[PDB]
């Protein structure tokens, strides 16, 4: 009869007290657990525990659950937080016998009628007013379908908070409504809700109403506990809105279920002025009024619209993958610079369309180079720069903390002593003491201060400060290092919490790519990190001016992907226009906009010669051929001159190229080769697949351009498309084949290694151009330039002001820096599995910039040791050579899963920066795959800058030996230290699983699996009648490390024996480190509790006491792994032994006496009896249950089996009997008799201080103490005894009775000398003395109330040893 209980706690909210760390100890009837360990007001404990008690269920569902959430510092005892409890059968009685997802109240005895101690959310089961003022919208994008041009909207506001929902007036037919309406939300603070839901819903008149946006406004972030206590306020203040594309095609939108609140918004929606103000009263109510004229005035003082100018300059645009055209990216910030709505200037915010080309390994990047494309916009947004330097200069602070705590946990896994990290802590601390002490910008004299920002002054000044004594408090207090380390995450988690800034109504600037119209991949850059700031650059944006690298994501990516589209280095910078001018600091390269015209000429089939015969198009013209411009057209600004002259002019080891195939056929037939069959990338007639040679100073080492089945196609591996007019060529492919298609692409690759005035052509007029002639060509074009620069005096700040242009703009470099990266990887380990054999096939494709390349295959292993340097000769990057050392690109390294037939897939990726140390040592580079990690990557990087730059024209040590021939291998410096280890193995059983697969487990087996040197211990041949293995000694060898970072952990793992192949595994284990691994009987009874008048001369005539443990066996102070599961950690053990160089016992159990008992009943009667469940035996001791006493002398015997482990617990109850209810519980308590025979001290039997054959002090165990002794010689290896009749030996040292019995009464039970002197040896290997247990009960109700003491005393004795003695009486 036994039951089982599942609690799950989830969350906490708003927890008494401040800087704690909670944890809850859950206990159910008794039986305590404890939780993992959260941080913060707002804990997040999401962990599960189980519990299961032996009993009838008439007894197990009145029990009840507690869910005692406490503080716990490092330093300092539990302290109360909330405490419930309620009952077992209010969770069985109700449906699914469970509750799921309650929210729950918190409380504290110090006083109940506080009300909450904050809130919780918890799952059981049972096994067998806000006065939110909204006053207008602006920019909100269409949702009506069209036949008043943008006005296609019907907006209303809804807000819900708490549960309660209100919603606005509609207004039909404006994209800029103007509400001004005040909604009063009558929830009562606080709630279980802790975040406001806002939506902007679009009225529908015949269909459902859609959904705008969803903004949120997270309630502690706009408030304070505490004199620095407020409620929570906000506004009038915008905030913006995110979710769906804005452009309206009608259909469903795929990206809908963005806006409403679910996933990062992908485009911004327009943005909503509201406020909101606390007017607490208990009177709860709710209402929609109107507001009059006097509150729409106050917020025109919070409209400072200023002008904002925003820079961006695209210096690559590699890691591309699946290029289907031509690729530009367009920066927009709110709805300016959205290149959908045509509203700019021709000037635009995209780059221009640019071809990816194929890198020569596996990826493909836009070839810019030495010229990088820069969009330049302006804006209309208010001015809040007073809050975004507050948050820039917390945030900076912020960050020079976190780097500088890891540049402390750097010198610490470097080893250095401990004065150069008390030198290290000590920099941080002047430094943050000198960051801190920087006065705060006042908002007193602002008048577009609201009330939020004048609370979060007196909050950051007070709470700063608070920083500043805690940091001189600690450095004149010098504690330990982990003493700092608790307080050095404390600030740094204040910072960041602080930092946030909830009235940023900036729109972060996304930045896009358009593959034509279809928009592919996104980034929101926020608009603090980029505003420049004229205070300084404690103030400024952390990529205000500094190039940033940004990996796009796909929209509705809610993970960081398994393919990656795209890698952009943005030179982004944000600010004032009248803060323009301070661009001229950041800027680096001539800065230009090229001057242009095109002047075409034309040569039909039959003409011969170039001509104007047959075009009808003007001659001197722009890109667009049809809308004339002559040479003049376009002339220098305010601030701009030339800077040359008319031109004609457009703009490693081994390389892989692709090859391209083209067929035709009709509708209903076969496929067939067509007269464009062979020809380039895009499939117009060129030289064909063969016709494509090696270049001169390289040579082809592939045999054949092969056939390529690696990419997203069908069966055959052609892409299909259909005949569309009025031209005589098909439009628009798709990879799948179905009846209709009539023309078909297919692909090809090959590889390699190493050893007319400019004009333009095309096929005709408006078609696809290219720079050559060649024989399919009918019409041309010359590209005549101009390079125009700002004046000197002004800078390159004079871009801002190229409004009136009517062109492209980009940042020309003269020259760029040559470099060479060295990727050293060694080893990786802990990768996923992705084929059928439980292995992986890791090769590691490693990018910088647009060079990438890959490493060899390991087959079939998932701890792969590729020991190979791949090395990127001649890598160029732009800029200052100061600017490219402390900003290096990322290299990423991704890891595939080769496959002989099918695709390769994802492994995982890890973010790097390269060292510029000449000899930078190996570290751990953790992979993921997005939604987890997947492992971990021995790599290192080194960066060399090389001797000389590489000019464009205006329009190293040693290689390291080789492991194989033309591959290299990491050097011998860098290599981490392998050596040979011996290691002799023991294994001697496991302890305490759970059930696994549908099964118990039966018969359990054990692999030892260090660094792939497989060693295999014997089985267990049935754990749940013995746990104990068959052979004891083993040996192995294994290549291993010497330093702890790069050592692999152990990996041990665990199998059932189940018959036919039928073996689970049914766990694994994890080392993480290996520091470990290198006068009558009742003369006795009285004496022995302290009564000296039922003792009589029994102590006087120097006899014995054995040790009544009126407390707990757990006061006495007397190698093990642990079993690891992937997710919750501990669940079972494995004993044995691991040095590196270079089963049924016979039981009896006496109860006889107890004392200490309450008058439970109200009648003033205590009528205990016994219970105890040992496996399938039970106590039902109510038949002899001694009637209204409260200390009762039982004196009953029990004798029982025992087997290991399922039988080797003794819970013991006590039960009072009742006259017509159910007998109600005492209390319990437990011991665990594994641990002592477990231990190696023998400390089953304990020992008398004499031995006797007969009397009190008659012998128990199997064997005399001679053959104890010498059971102790052939356990432990020590040299046999030799007996004497007067004195014994141990050890081969010399004993003798004189020792014992020197002023002793030698009484007539003692026994053979030889007996009492190995006894008193045994008495100096710290065997404990003779055990009776008066073990205190405690109460299921309370954790903390004893309820009685309990005394008795067990024998135990395995009986493959021998005999034990005979029992007595009590
Ligand atoms: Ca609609
Ligand atoms: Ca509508
Ligand atoms: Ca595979
Ligand atoms: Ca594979
Ligand atoms: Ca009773
Ligand atoms: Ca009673």
Known sequence: QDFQIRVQVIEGRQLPGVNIKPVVKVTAAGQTKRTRIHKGNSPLFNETLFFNLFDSPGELFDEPIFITVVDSRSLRTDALLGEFRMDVGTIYREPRHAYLRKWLLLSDPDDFSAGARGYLKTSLCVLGHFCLKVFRAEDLPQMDDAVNKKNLVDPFVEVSFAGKMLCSKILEKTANPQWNQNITLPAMFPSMCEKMRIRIIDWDRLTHNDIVATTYLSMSKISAPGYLGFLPTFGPCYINLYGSPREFTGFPDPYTELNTGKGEGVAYRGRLLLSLETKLVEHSEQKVEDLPADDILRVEKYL?????????????????????????????????????????????????????????????????????????????????????????????????????????HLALKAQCSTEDVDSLVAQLTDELIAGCSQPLGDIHETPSATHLDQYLYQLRTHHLSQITEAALALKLGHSELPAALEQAEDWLLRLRALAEEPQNSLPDIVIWMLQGDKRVAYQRVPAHQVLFSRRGANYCGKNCGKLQTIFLKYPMEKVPGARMPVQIRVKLWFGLSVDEKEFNQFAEGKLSVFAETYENETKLALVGNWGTTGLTYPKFSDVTGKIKLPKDSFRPSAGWTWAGDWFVCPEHLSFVEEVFENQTRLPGGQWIYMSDNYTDVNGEKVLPKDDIECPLGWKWE??????????????????????????????????????????????????????????????????????????????????????????????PAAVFALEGALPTISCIFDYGNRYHLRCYMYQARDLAAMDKDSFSDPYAIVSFLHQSQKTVVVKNTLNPTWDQTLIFYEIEIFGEPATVAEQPPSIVVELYDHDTYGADEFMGRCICQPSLERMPRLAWFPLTRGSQPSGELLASFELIQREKPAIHHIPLPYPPPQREANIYMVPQNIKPALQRTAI???????????????????????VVECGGQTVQSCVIRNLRKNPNFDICTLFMEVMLPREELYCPPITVKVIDNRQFGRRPVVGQCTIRSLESFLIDWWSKFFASIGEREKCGSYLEKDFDTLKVYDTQLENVEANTFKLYRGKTSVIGEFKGLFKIYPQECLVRIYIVRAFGLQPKDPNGKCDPYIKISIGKKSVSDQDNYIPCTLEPVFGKMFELTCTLPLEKDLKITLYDYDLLSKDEKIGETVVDLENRLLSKFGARCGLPQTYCVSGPNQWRDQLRPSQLL?????????????????????????????????????????????????????????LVPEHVESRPLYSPLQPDIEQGKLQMWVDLFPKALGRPGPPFNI
């Open 304 to 408: 400072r619209r200023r002008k904002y100018s925003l820079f961006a300059a695209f210096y690559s645009a590699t890691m591309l993958q699946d290029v289907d055209d031509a690729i530009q990216f367009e920066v927009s910030i709110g709805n300016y610079g959205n290149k959908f709505d045509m509203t700019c200037l021709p000037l635009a915010s995209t780059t221009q369309y640019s071809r990816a080309v194929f890198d020569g390994c596996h990826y493909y990047y836009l070839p810019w180079g030495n010229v990088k494309p820069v969009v330049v916009l302006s804006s209309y947004w208010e001015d809040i720069s007073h809050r975004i330097e507050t948050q820039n200069q917390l945030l900076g602070i912020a960050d020079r903390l976190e780097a500088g705590l890891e540049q402390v």
């Open 702 to 795: 592939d045999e054949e351009w092969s056939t390529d089945l690696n990419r997203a196609v069908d069966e055959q591996g052609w892409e299909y498309s259909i005949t569309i007019p009025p031209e005589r060529k098909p439009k628009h492919w798709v990879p799948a084949e179905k009846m209709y298609y009539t023309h078909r692409r297919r692909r090809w690759v090959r590889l390699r290694r190493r050893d007319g005035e400019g004009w333009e052509y095309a096929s005709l007029f408006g078609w696809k151009f290219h720079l050559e002639y060649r024989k399919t060509d009918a019409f041309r074009r010359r590209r005549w330039r101009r390079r125009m620069e700002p004046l000197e005096k002004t800078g």
């Open 984 to 1006: 002799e193995i023991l294994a001697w059983g496991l302890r305490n699983m759970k059930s696994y697969q549908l099964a118990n487990i039966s018969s359990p087996s054990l």
């Open 1270 to 1326: 010498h059971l102790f010689c052939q356990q432990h290896r020590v040299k046999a005894p030799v007996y004497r009749t007067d004195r014994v030996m141990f050890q081969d040292k010399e004993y003798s009775i004189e020792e014992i019995e020197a002023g002793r009464i030698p009484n007539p039970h003692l026994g053979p000398v030889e007996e009492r002197l190995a006894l008193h040896v045994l008495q100096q290997q710290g």
